[PDB]
Enzyme design. Structure first.
Site, short mmCIF file in Angstrom:
data_model
loop_
_atom_site.label_atom_id
_atom_site.label_comp_id
_atom_site.label_asym_id
_atom_site.label_seq_id
_atom_site.Cartn_x
_atom_site.Cartn_y
_atom_site.Cartn_z
N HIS B 170 0.88 -1.14 0.00
CA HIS B 170 0.00 0.00 0.00
C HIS B 170 0.93 1.20 0.00
CE1 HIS B 170 -3.70 -2.23 0.63
NE2 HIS B 170 -2.90 -3.05 1.24
N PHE B 240 -7.73 0.51 9.41
CA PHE B 240 -8.25 0.53 8.06
C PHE B 240 -8.72 1.91 7.75
CE2 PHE B 240 -8.23 -3.47 9.81
CZ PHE B 240 -7.91 -4.32 8.75
N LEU B 242 -7.63 4.52 9.25
CA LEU B 242 -6.46 5.34 9.24
C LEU B 242 -5.76 5.41 7.88
CD1 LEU B 242 -5.02 5.00 12.77
CD2 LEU B 242 -4.16 6.70 11.13
N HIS B 458 -5.39 -11.71 -0.50
CA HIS B 458 -5.08 -12.48 0.66
C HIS B 458 -5.22 -13.97 0.71
CE1 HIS B 458 -2.96 -9.94 3.36
NE2 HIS B 458 -3.79 -8.94 3.12
N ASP B 513 2.54 -5.28 2.50
CA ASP B 513 1.40 -4.54 3.09
C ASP B 513 1.72 -3.13 3.55
OD1 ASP B 513 -1.04 -5.95 5.38
OD2 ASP B 513 -1.38 -5.06 3.35
N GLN B 517 4.42 0.37 9.36
CA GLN B 517 3.99 -0.19 10.63
C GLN B 517 4.76 -1.49 10.99
OE1 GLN B 517 1.34 1.18 13.56
NE2 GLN B 517 2.36 1.91 11.70
O1 LIG Z 1 -0.89 -0.45 9.91
P1 LIG Z 1 -1.06 1.35 9.58
O2 LIG Z 1 0.39 1.97 9.16
O3 LIG Z 1 -1.65 2.42 10.98
O4 LIG Z 1 -2.07 1.47 8.33
C1 LIG Z 1 -2.67 0.31 7.74
C2 LIG Z 1 -3.16 0.65 6.35
O5 LIG Z 1 -2.45 -0.06 5.29
C3 LIG Z 1 -3.28 -0.97 4.56
N1 LIG Z 1 -3.22 -2.39 4.98
C4 LIG Z 1 -2.50 -2.96 5.99
N2 LIG Z 1 -2.70 -4.29 6.10
C5 LIG Z 1 -3.57 -4.63 5.16
C6 LIG Z 1 -3.89 -3.42 4.46
N3 LIG Z 1 -4.80 -3.47 3.38
C7 LIG Z 1 -5.87 -4.12 3.33
N4 LIG Z 1 -6.33 -4.89 4.28
C8 LIG Z 1 -5.62 -5.78 5.10
C9 LIG Z 1 -4.14 -5.80 4.76
O6 LIG Z 1 -3.96 -5.85 3.29
C10 LIG Z 1 -4.67 -0.61 4.98
O7 LIG Z 1 -5.35 -0.02 3.90
C11 LIG Z 1 -4.65 0.33 6.17
O8 LIG Z 1 -5.37 1.52 5.96
ZN LIG Z 2 -3.15 -4.96 1.94
#
Ligand SMILES: O=P(O)(O)OC[C@H]1O[C@@H](n2cnc3c2N=CNC[C@H]3O)[C@H](O)[C@@H]1O
Ligand SMILES: [Zn+2]
Ligand SMILES: O=P(O)(O)OC[C@H]1O[C@@H](n2cnc3c2N=CNC[C@H]3O)[C@H](O)[C@@H]1O
Ligand SMILES: [Zn+2]
Lengths: 616, 616
Positions: B170, B240, B242, B458, B513, B517
């Site tokens: 992402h 999510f 966020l 996933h 991903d 984080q």
């Molecule tokens: O873990 P932070 O830096 O506070 O942000 C997480 C973001 O990154 C994406 N993300 C993280 N983990 C995933 C994500 N995307 C989809 N869903 C589950 C998995 O793919 C999400 O969109 C989510 O808004």
């Molecule tokens: Zn993802």
């Protein structure tokens, strides 16, 4: 909590930190087998009345890197029975009258070695270790979040920010292939026809050596492409020999991964530098690089020293430990040495000489103010006749075989010692005994190691002796462990005792060993901490607790410890850790300091030593 | 073999590579419940007669990055019932007459959804999957070394050398804090008083915003220090939201981690760049960065497009997938949208428009030749009424609730589709449907996903359905998985199905991903592969097999695939992999191609499809 890699984002205003949490009292009385604890006491004392320590400690302390004249005399060495003596500056008859003789240290060793496997004590210690674990777990169950959150009051500091030290690395393996390779790949292109080595008749250029081995260039790769003097000639290239044995060595290896070679080191050094620069890049990762001295030639010391200087090899982050490979038996076939003694002579004199008269061995000095400890090595598993008490002096040892381990450390201890209790005397840096021990082999390595050294490199075997493991707890001996490497040969990853030694509160640290062979990332040891955190499920308070005490285990200046951890770091316990520069909950260490204080009390059955300051 | 991190140095002259190994025949006849395999056939066909694919494939193909005039007309869009129609350039009455209607796709979905949980089929598939595993293991037992060694014939290529792609990242989370932070920390120092945002009354400088949130500077840290429009005002900041929710967003986050903000993006972009540069540094790590488009404003598309250009955001290694967060229900409170339809309108027209008349949406084009697929998202677990058959059109959907998943993909499929079967028509790049699916939630996500999309993000849930898992095997659907992340919330690390999906030969890949984080290293995804290799015990042939097919799963140019893997890569099977650029044993893939060929034969009971070329 366990495992930070994941941990989601949260919040906060904690702007005033919090000790406080669930305390867990227990206490337990005692049975007739107190005459066990007693036994522990002894072993506990013995070690103490032995391992050398600087009468006046670092925190009670009163541009380039090289030069300055001294001169001051003070004399006589006079090494009797492998144990030097250095008599009073003039000529005395008592000397700086220190160190306990070889036999003794062997009889005390048996002593430990008895209690160590004596029935009921093995039992008590197991019961107390596992009991140690539980408590930590319970504690985690009551306070993990209390610890999580504390860390949020020191907003600034998180994992990266905290300075962690690679407490066990072998200089040479300290580089990633992609780099190393590209170093080579390049210095070929941009400089073929440059004499490099002279083997088989003439001096060859670079292009030569390569086409000489054939398989070369775009095909080169870290793997066995160190293919030799080259032929059919027999040499085993397991791994220990591939780094511990000086001879029978390959060609690119002699060129690029050594210093006592032809072009003086112009290439190893040259490489080190860009290691340091990138090291000094990430600011927080330090390194206690191991460098060797076989003790075949008196030169080696000065010889090496000059290698450092003439190349301006210094970093804030790097210090050095001299590693002497226990290979006498090889050096006694090669006829280059005649009796063990010769070796004590090749390492414990070229320095000593440099201590009495700095200027007789200059820029050896500018080096030793960077050496921090003496590490000795080789495949721990090679078999051996475990030393008796009436044991042949170092110069009566002419026979064909390698002297046992115990034997090595001993004479490697005294010397180190009696020399230490003088470089101290003269106000010069001192070196600590930090052996590679207990990675394989016999249980006694540790027993002896326990009686005579500071840190240690392996400890994997503490896992097979309740008792030694328990002492090391008490004593707080500190282990610099390389799981990822240990996983190569000697032990499955998942069967490695680290996490457990960590739970029980032993002074563990995560190290690296051979980042060349071992890791996949630009950032070696972090990657260690990172796969560790993940398979064992560690939190940050956990890694941070680890990284933090990696440093306590380290050999750097008070000036830097203070700045890295805290100006109060010399303080035994919780009041001795500045979470703002350590990121670990005053409450994790208070838990640790109090469970230890507790155990100590259990063993010195109410009448405890105490001390309000750590140790060196 | 398993686990390269350790693996010791060895040797070699293999200068002529070797296929050949233990072959294992079995074969099995069949029972009356062949009328199961039949059922598989259908589902297997259905998917086929659906997922769009370019009538003429990449390998049969006949300075900066932006500009050039076109103009060519060709017209009419005419979106009927959420499904656009684009009639013949002039004015027809049949259109480029494609795509199957919404209902249908819902009834076929039930169909799959039946067989999928029908008794005896669940059994057969389980029996066949686990049977799939065994064989691979047995094979490993007979040939791991045969595979180890082959790799030694391609001296050059080892792990690093092989190009691996982060098939699921992402954009935004793609940066390490230490960097991100330091970016900020700096752009504060070296430029306080610079208008950045205008919230609560006036435009604030930078120094303002910070002291405005108070907790700022040397105290800043990735954790929840995105503290808002700021107050007591209520917003949940799980995770999510966020990243998936555009509004109710924080201050530094609006400044530094977004583009549709005030200073246009001057900071997010600015950051991306130094991401790319360092990306292009290590040469081999690619990235399929996810970028969003909520579909509230028609602008978003062009709006974003221009963001790319005006910042010269292009790399050989990076491509993009547009991610539309399934948040209609939010956009229907906010009154900014009135019926689901509006969204199909905000994403499937700003492009379409750009396809008919390139120049009506220029430098949107220069962008789309870099977009590679459409990924849709949000917390998979939020509850939902699983769609029936007689289902309300997209513009009859005015109610208060978010339309189900299935529903989303559907209309997100057709459009994507019917638009694809024209950008193709006009000879322009096409985009593939690559949904985030089966990370949590209901089993049907996958069922539907299986009928309509290319890759998937996933798959964690395939683990709860023998049947879907089995199809995905056959079909060879390919999963881009992030274990380390999945470990955060939804699943323990050690309980993650990847290694198993890998053993059974599913088209798995390791992704990242949120490197922000999640990871601890400068090199994010390698670190993934590295902790993976270690907890699951993977060899290099194993990682390399993974990295290799990460690329097959990727969306890059034939020109680059060929150069990265092999010019014969389009070939189904072993004869389609150049170990000299892939480092994986012709024998590993021959094993894989033959066990698959075998299974296929089992299910199309002797009468198999075949195909001698992969697919896109
Ligand atoms: O873990 P932070 O830096 O506070 O942000 C997480 C973001 O990154 C994406 N993300 C993280 N983990 C995933 C994500 N995307 C989809 N869903 C589950 C998995 O793919 C999400 O969109 C989510 O808004
Ligand atoms: Zn993802
Ligand atoms: O694993 P390679 O790059 O072929 O070389 C291994 C070398 O690095 C050191 N090393 C690696 N692993 C260890 C090492 N040191 C002592 N013994 C066991 C363990 O500490 C060894 O000295 C050995 O010579
Ligand atoms: Zn070592």
């Amino acid at each position: 909590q366990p495992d930070p890699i994941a941990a989601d984002i949260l919040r906060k205003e904690p702007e005033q930190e919090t000790f406080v949490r669930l305390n867990v009292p227990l206490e337990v009385p005692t049975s007739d087998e107190v005459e066990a604890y007693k036994c522990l006491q002894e072993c506990l004392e013995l070690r103490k009345r032995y391992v050398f320590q600087e009468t006046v400690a670092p925190w009670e302390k009163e541009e380039p890197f090289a030069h300055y004249p001294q001169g001051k005399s003070d004399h006589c060495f006079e090494m009797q029975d492998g144990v030097v003596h250095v008599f009073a500056n003039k000529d005395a008859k008592e000397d700086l009258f220190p160190v306990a003789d070889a036999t003794a240290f062997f009889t005390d060793l048996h002593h430990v070695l008895k209690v160590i496997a004596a029935g009921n004590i093995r039992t008590l210690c197991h019961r107390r270790l596992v009991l140690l674990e539980q408590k930590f777990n319970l504690h985690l169950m009551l306070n993990a979040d209390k610890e999580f959150l504390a860390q949020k009051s020191a907003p600034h500091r998180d994992f990266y920010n905290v300075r962690k030290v690679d407490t066990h690395v072998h200089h040479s393996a300290c580089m990633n292939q992609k780099h190393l390779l590209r170093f080579i790949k390049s210095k070929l292109r941009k400089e073929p026809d440059e004499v490099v080595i002279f083997r088989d008749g003439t001096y060859l250029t670079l292009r030569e050596v390569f086409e000489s081995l054939d398989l070369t260039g775009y095909d080169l790769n870290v793997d066995l492409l160190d293919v030799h003097a080259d032929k059919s000639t027999f040499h085993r290239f397991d791994k220990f020999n591939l780094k511990y044995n000086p001879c029978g060595q390959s060609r690119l290896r002699e060129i690029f991964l050594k210093q006592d070679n032809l072009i003086q080191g112009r290439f190893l050094g040259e490489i080190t530098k860009q290691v340091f620069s990138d090291l000094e890049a990430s600011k927080y990762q330090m390194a206690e690089y191991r460098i060797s001295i076989y003790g075949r030639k008196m030169s080696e010391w000065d010889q090496l020293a000059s290698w450092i200087v003439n190349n301006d090899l210094y970093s804030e982050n790097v210090v050095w430990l001299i590693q002497l490979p226990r290979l006498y038996n090889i050096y006694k076939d090669m006829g280059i040495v005649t009796s063990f003694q010769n070796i004590l002579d090749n390492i414990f004199i070229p320095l000593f000489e440099a201590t009495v008269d700095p200027d007789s061995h200059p820029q050896l000095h500018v080096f030793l103010k960077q050496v921090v400890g003496f590490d000795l090595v080789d495949d721990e598993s090679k078999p051996e006749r475990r030393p008796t008490k009436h044991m042949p002096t170092p110069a009566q040892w002419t026979n064909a075989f390698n002297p046992a381990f115990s034997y090595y450390v001993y004479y490697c201890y005294a010397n180190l010692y009696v020399l230490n209790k003088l470089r101290e005397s003269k106000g010069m840096t001192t070196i600590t005994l930090r052996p590679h021990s207990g990675e394989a082999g016999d249980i006694d390595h540790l027993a002896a190691t326990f009686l005579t050294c500071h840190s240690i490199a392996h400890g994997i075997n503490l896992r097979k002796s309740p008792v030694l493991q328990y002492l090391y707890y008490l004593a707080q001996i500190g282990l610099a462990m390389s799981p990822l490497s240990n996983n190569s040969l000697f032990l499955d990853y998942h069967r490695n005792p680290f996490p457990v030694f960590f739970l029980r509160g032993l002074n563990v640290s995560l190290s690296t060993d051979d980042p060349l062979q071992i890791h996949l990332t630009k950032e070696p040891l972090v990657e260690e901490y990172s796969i560790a955190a993940s398979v064992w499920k560690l939190s940050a308070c956990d890694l941070c607790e680890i990284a933090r005490n990696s440093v306590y285990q380290s050999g750097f200046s008070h000036a830097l410890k203070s700045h890295w951890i805290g100006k109060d770091y010399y303080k035994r316990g919780p009041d001795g850790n500045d979470i703002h520069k350590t990121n670990v909950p005053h409450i994790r260490v208070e838990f640790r300091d109090t469970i230890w204080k507790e155990e100590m009390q259990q063993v010195y059955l109410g009448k405890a030593v105490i001390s309000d300051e750590v140790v060196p």
